[PDB]
Design a protein around this ligand. Sequence first.
Ligand SMILES: CC(C)(C)c1cc(C(C)(C)C)cc(S(N)(=O)=O)c1
Ligand SMILES: CC(C)(C)c1cc(C(C)(C)C)cc(S(N)(=O)=O)c1
Ligand SMILES: [Zn+2]
Ligand SMILES: [Zn+2]
Lengths: 261, 261
Amino acid sequence: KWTYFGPDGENSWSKKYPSCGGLLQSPIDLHSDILQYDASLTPLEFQGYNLSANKQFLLTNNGHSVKLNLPSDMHIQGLQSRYSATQLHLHWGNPNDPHGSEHTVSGQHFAAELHIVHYNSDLYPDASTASNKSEGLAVLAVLIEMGSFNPSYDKIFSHLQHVKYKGQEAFVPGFNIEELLPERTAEYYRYRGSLTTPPCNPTVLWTVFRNPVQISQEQLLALETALYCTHMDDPSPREMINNFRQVQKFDERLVYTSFSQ
Amino acid sequence: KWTYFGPDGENSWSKKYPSCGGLLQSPIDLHSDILQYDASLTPLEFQGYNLSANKQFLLTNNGHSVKLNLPSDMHIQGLQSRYSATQLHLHWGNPNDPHGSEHTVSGQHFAAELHIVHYNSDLYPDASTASNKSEGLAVLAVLIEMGSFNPSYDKIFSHLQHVKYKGQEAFVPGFNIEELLPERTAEYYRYRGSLTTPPCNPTVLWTVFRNPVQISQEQLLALETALYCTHMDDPSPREMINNFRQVQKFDERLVYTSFSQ
Ligand SMILES: CC(C)(C)c1cc(C(C)(C)C)cc(S(N)(=O)=O)c1
Ligand SMILES: CC(C)(C)c1cc(C(C)(C)C)cc(S(N)(=O)=O)c1
Ligand SMILES: [Zn+2]
Ligand SMILES: [Zn+2]
């Protein structure tokens, strides 16, 4: 099934997943002509993000990314419903081209991108249910640039060699997920878009923080070399690299900014 | 059949046109990391480009772009085969976001892009036969930016009002097509890629000139506003805008440059 390279790659997803050829698709390039300040974009509140170090949370290689399952007592507030967390995961490039963010800024890729997925729990029982309904999902995106070593991201990356292959699972002790977010979270871009992976449901309220975080070259190299899209016993192994979608046409959307300059 | 917007937009091209989901797809981002000087990239010569002003050439709005039909005695000298001209056309954005080149440079769109399409007339009888064959096509691409008024581009643009709607046609008196090319045409990027429109055949030798040309603000606005994709008697007219493909992944490959400096 679907991949980021070859016959089953992104230009072919719409063959099996119609919404991937529909409107309101993500990611997009964030550039001046389509930005507009909106003073009503007040600061989000991150509730229940400080996960207990004595509890443990499931990390899974699902064949397309590495994902950490999050508890439903973790929420974002500030939105017009409460949105409950369900999972976070990453997108990245490869060792010879560490430029695999999904969203771009003024045409430039960052090294990687973190997505923290939430669903409207006011309205829906689980994320799977919410995924194909209006205002079902809210995703927070953190842009990641090559920089200093990041001990908070390492709480995830230290477990990659235990989830190298599709289907494998590991437990990560709790930590404060807010440490994965950048400086000045009150500054963000906001827009209506989609899942960036099949089935590309146009049901996501996106928040992309303005400021990136840093992880080191060695942490990116671990992330880019540790994982496979395939099962441990697959005789045609495929490295999990370059797992980002190209940016999409705007189709008349604006992107709203909580910052005026 | 296909479009640049809505259900039949670029992510769905591969359903009817499988090569749109295959290898070697264009356009691409031209950035320093993938550039490599190649001394074999000598200057092309543009032969037969000074079209007799006693002859006339058909301008058509075909619902995807505006195209001028060119005579086969017009050709590129300097490639291994002679490539004969078939037609030129443009790609552009829209007045709210006037950055609709196909190729990008260091992640940045230019305002528009002109393509002069040629086919291998040494090997093949016409452009339609060549389009799906080895060594079949060669495209010259000129990046366009806003700046001073360009009389030569006005030799085309002054006729746009007569090809407002799909299916309409105007005659253009011969002028020197070389006037549409930028300064220092010896400076270019070269790579093997594809058509940027269905059927997306991977049979194009691209030459993208390093230096852009200029057209005025008013010229660019005319191109963006003069044309519709729809027939005149269509009860739901659509503006012809944003008629460019998003950039494609281009991994483990180089773009060769005729310049180092
Ligand atoms: C909502 C859910 C269906 C859980 C989802 C999954 C993915 C992956 C994990 C397949 C990458 C990617 C996304 S995305 N990149 O946030 O649109 C969302
Ligand atoms: C539809 C239109 C925009 C006019 C177009 C036509 C062609 C053909 C006819 C050579 C295939 C080629 C291209 S392109 N952008 O040079 O690959 C574009
Ligand atoms: Zn994601
Ligand atoms: Zn073209």
